[PDB]
Amino acid sequence: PITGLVYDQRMMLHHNMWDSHHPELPQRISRIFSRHEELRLLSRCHRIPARLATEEELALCHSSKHISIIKSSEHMKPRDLNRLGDEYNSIFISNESYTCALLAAGSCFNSAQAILTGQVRNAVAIVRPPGHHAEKDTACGFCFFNTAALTARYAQSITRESLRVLIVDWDVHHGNGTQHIFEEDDSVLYISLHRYEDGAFFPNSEDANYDKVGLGKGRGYNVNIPWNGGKMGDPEYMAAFHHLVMPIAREFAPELVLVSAGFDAARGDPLGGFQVTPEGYAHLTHQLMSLAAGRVLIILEGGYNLTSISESMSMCTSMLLGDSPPSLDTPLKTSATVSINNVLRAHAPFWSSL
Numbered sequence: 001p002i003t004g005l006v007y008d009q010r011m012m013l014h015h016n017m018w019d020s021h022h023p024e025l026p027q028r029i030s031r032i033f034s035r036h037e038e039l040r041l042l043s044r045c046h047r048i049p050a051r052l053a054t055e056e057e058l059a060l061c062h063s064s065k066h067i068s069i070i071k072s073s074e075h076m077k078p079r080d081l082n083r084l085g086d087e088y089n090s091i092f093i094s095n096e097s098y099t100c101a102l103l104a105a106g107s108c109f110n111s112a113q114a115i116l117t118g119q120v121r122n123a124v125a126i127v128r129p130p131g132h133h134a135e136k137d138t139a140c141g142f143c144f145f146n147t148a149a150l151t152a153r154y155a156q157s158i159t160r161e162s163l164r165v166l167i168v169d170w171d172v173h174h175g176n177g178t179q180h181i182f183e184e185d186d187s188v189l190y191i192s193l194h195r196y197e198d199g200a201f202f203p204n205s206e207d208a209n210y211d212k213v214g215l216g217k218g219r220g221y222n223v224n225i226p227w228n229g230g231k232m233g234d235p236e237y238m239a240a241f242h243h244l245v246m247p248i249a250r251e252f253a254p255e256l257v258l259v260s261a262g263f264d265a266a267r268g269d270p271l272g273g274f275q276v277t278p279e280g281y282a283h284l285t286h287q288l289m290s291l292a293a294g295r296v297l298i299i300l301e302g303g304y305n306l307t308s309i310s311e312s313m314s315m316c317t318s319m320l321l322g323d324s325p326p327s328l329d330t331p332l333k334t335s336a337t338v339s340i341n342n343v344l345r346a347h348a349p350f351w352s353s354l
């Protein structure tokens with residue numbers, strides 16, 4: 001019953017040289033790491049070493065051209081870096097961005113390998129920059145490479161190609177890159193909960209709507225849970241897991257669970273506008289541990305209130321270590337019931353448990 005943890009100072013080197021107060025702060029990971037220390041959770045975890053992902057490992061999900069542009073950014077001058085960063089949707093680049101993204105991916109490869117070989121039962125990855133917005137051919141939303149998507153492909157590469165991986169994305173923003181990478185894939189089930197607002201919330205695409213169920217062989221293996229009309233919180237995420245996430249995940253019977261654990265849906269986040277409490281994230285973590293014989297990897301994504309994400313991820317690590325879930329504090333808002341009902345009707349054809 002061992003819980004793994006990976007963290008490396010070197011992932012702080014990715015920074016915004018023009019906007020030092022940019023919300024994707026280097027201190028995001030150190031604040032989460034520091035909160036684990038003062039809560040005495042760090043000494044109960046097994047430290048997993050970080051490492052750089054290889055370019056061949058990046059090719060599992062990303063085109064060679066995209067890898068080369070970011071690899072070339074390591075030697076650019078400040079003026080070249082600003083022009084290149086501005087060519088993407090919400091991306092800043094420094095000379096250390098490429099190495100930090102390599103470390104974030106490679107840190108998750110070691111964690112998945114530790115889980116899949118039984119060295120640890122579950123693991124948490126405090127990494128940056130995030131990954132779930134990165135597409136096959138371009139960077140997006142502070143993400144350069146899709147760390148969660150790469151880890152799923154890496155997990156299959158060290159087991160079997162058809163290894164069933166469930167990716168739960170509870171980051172408040174839709175993982176557009178993760179959806180597109182596995183859109184035609186039946187071996188990687190993608191479930192995302194996200195603020196939608198009829199496509200007005202970032203990343204501002206109708207690909208995040210409930211009717212996108214996957215394509216080809218992947219039909220039914222892409223579950224979007226979009227929220228519309230107002231500040232969502234614990235009761236809405238509790239209901240979505242009870243009605244949609246947990247029934248679909250159990251029928252899928254995953255062999256590995258990856259959590260794109262963004263904490264920008266948390267109370268107090270300056271970007272999400274939601275009110276999910278640290279206890280809420282703990283209960284969601286506890287429910288996912290009932291899958292894949294407890295083989296759960298928590299990967300940091302978004303989340304930009306330093307105090308909120310520190311408490312929230314530490315609560316998740318507390319669940320992986322076996323602690324009992326803390327008790328929650330409300331009737332579902334009408335629009336939330338409407339959203340859950342739309343997903344149920346869209347995915348009932350594919351999941352008899354619905």
Ligand SMILES: O=C(O)CCCC[C@@H](S)CCS
Pocket residue numbers: 090130133141142171173201202262264271301302303
């Ligand atoms: O457009 C917005 O609503 C603000 C920026 C979006 C935040 C994204 S870029 C964070 C990725 S987890």
Ligand SMILES: [K+]
Pocket residue numbers: 169170171172173174175192193194
């Ligand atoms: K999401």
Ligand SMILES: [K+]
Pocket residue numbers: 182183184185186188189190214218221222
């Ligand atoms: K899929």
Ligand SMILES: [Zn+2]
Pocket residue numbers: 171172173262264302303
């Ligand atoms: Zn986000």
